[PDB]
Amino acid sequence: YIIQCIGSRTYQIEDDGSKSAISRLISSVYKPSIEELYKVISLHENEIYLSLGIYSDKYRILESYVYNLLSINYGCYQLFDFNSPDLKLIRFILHLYAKLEVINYAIKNGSWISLFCNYPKSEMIKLWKKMWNITSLRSPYTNANFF
Amino acid sequence: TARYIRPNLLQDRLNLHDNFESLWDTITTSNYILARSVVPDLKELVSTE
Secondary structure, three states: OHHHHHOOOOOOOOOOOOOOHHHHHHOOOOOOOHHHHHHHHOOOOOOOOOOOOOOOOHHHHHHHHHHHHOOOOOOOHHHOOOOOOOOOOEOOHHHHHHHHHHHHHHHOOOOOOOEOOOOOHHHHHHHHHHHOOOOOOOOOOOOOOOO | OOOOOOOOOOOOOOOOOOOOOHHHHHHHHHHHHHHHOOOOOOOOOOOOO
16 A cells, blocks of 8 residues: 555665765775764764775765664565655654654554654754664564575 | 897787777887886975975
8 A cells, every 4th residue: 555655666776885985995805884984974073984095975984873773674564655745644853753753653543644753953853863872672573584 | 259139129010090099099008017117206396285
């Protein structure tokens, strides 16, 4: 039903930061994971390492890290076009959170819901700090990635 | 008492560029790598960072 309404994608959502300028520059033969790029990007200009042999990319590293934590590429979500024009029903994280909520409701109800967001300007700064301090949860079994 | 062998070096008595492209390409290539083997490796220039 979700595909019938919003469609599906024939692509994978960059979830490793492989498509960032800093990574390309580092690619030295070393290969830092998304986690490392995430920690490194969250550093001060002076500290930001390029010790290996060699920007505001800061947004993209976070995107890949977040998508990884949402397994947006595994499970059944990998079959959903998360940039579907049809998925209008929403009025970066606020948006993705908005999209997931609508999709999940669709799966557990057959009907859609529209979400509105009036996030105060003050609240955004508090939230912004939280974004660069998210830890993980290993469990590999959850692996549903089939196609 | 000295003597020396004159390595003769007359021109491309074979105009190897007229129609034979195929081979020129192979030459250029060659002469090219040859060049890089020379082309002095640069020196000290504003630290990357």
